[PDB]
Design a protein around this ligand. Sequence first.
Ligand code: SF4
Ligand SMILES: [Ca+2]
Ligand SMILES: [Ca+2]
Length: 349
Amino acid sequence: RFPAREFQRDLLDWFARERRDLPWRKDRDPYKVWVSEVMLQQTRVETVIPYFEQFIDRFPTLEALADADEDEVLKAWEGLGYYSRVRNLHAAVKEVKTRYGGKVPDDPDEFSRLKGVGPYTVGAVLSLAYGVPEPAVDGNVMRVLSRLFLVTDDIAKPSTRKRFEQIVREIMAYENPGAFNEALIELGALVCTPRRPSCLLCPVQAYCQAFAEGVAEELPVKMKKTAVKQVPLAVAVLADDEGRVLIRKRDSTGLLANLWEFPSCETDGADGKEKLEQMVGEQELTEPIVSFEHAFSHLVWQLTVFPGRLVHGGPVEEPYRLAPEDELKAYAFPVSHQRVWREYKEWAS
DNA sequence: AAGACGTGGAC
DNA sequence: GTCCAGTCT
Ligand code: SF4
Ligand SMILES: [Ca+2]
Ligand SMILES: [Ca+2]
């Protein structure tokens, strides 16, 4: 029904001919492949390149990453987003050391048991670093495979992902799966793109049923995004007479887990300053200086910055921490509060 | 199932 | 504005 062998030759050829020279394709090392594939989840290649090199420069081996403390690994991830990925990788790596003594499992079932390792990562790491013919179905693969085979099912469904995963089994090159998988991902990245794909340039344009029908731009099928919720947030930038600033470490559960931030509180509506004042007193503000929005995937933060002065009438208890201005750079803030700071600094000038 | 979970490019 | 570059619960 489908000439796989020919398909697999025109794909791998184009790949060897067009592949990008990315930092994590310098070698087939499980550790570096693993880090790169976690960074790449929901994150474009061009964004990841700098982070991958800072990260591997700071954590060259699996044991270096395991031996580091949360703050250091999480600082290395500052600005990337979806920060539970690095908490799960940090733990998944601490596991391979305490349990497996540092060697990355090559058994699919054994590798998936680690936190952060979903179906894609199992296929990406094992097929590249060990040759295991497990599929690595990402958004690129799902877009390619849906166009090639005219699969008209909602990709958002996990069931559709499992269908694609069986298609991959059927047309794979079991000889060299890692090369086969990266070629599908690369194909979707460079040629068969979400919009106006270069089907003429495409090396497998003869096989693409969508091109034959002229409906490539109508695929893949994915339902429209759910509208996100708006959330007013009030932020306080408090500095004493020695220039030190107060910050707190968010809890390890939920949004922006274990990241540092300037004291804040969700304000249903009115009395932003009052709510900030009372909340800080339990565990001296002035008017706001700026207000802006910051988007998440599932909600929007409408922030409002309140400068303030604090006088020490007691000790700074957890989760709070009194940090000089020069030492803030050592803490990992989300992008929202990195701007809060920048806004406060330029206002005071 | 589908909401939670960051941030930035390309239309 | 829209779409999009995965995993956990
Ligand atoms: S022929 Fe066109 S639609 Fe099909 S895979 Fe190639 S770029 Fe995508
Ligand atoms: Ca798993
Ligand atoms: Ca929480």
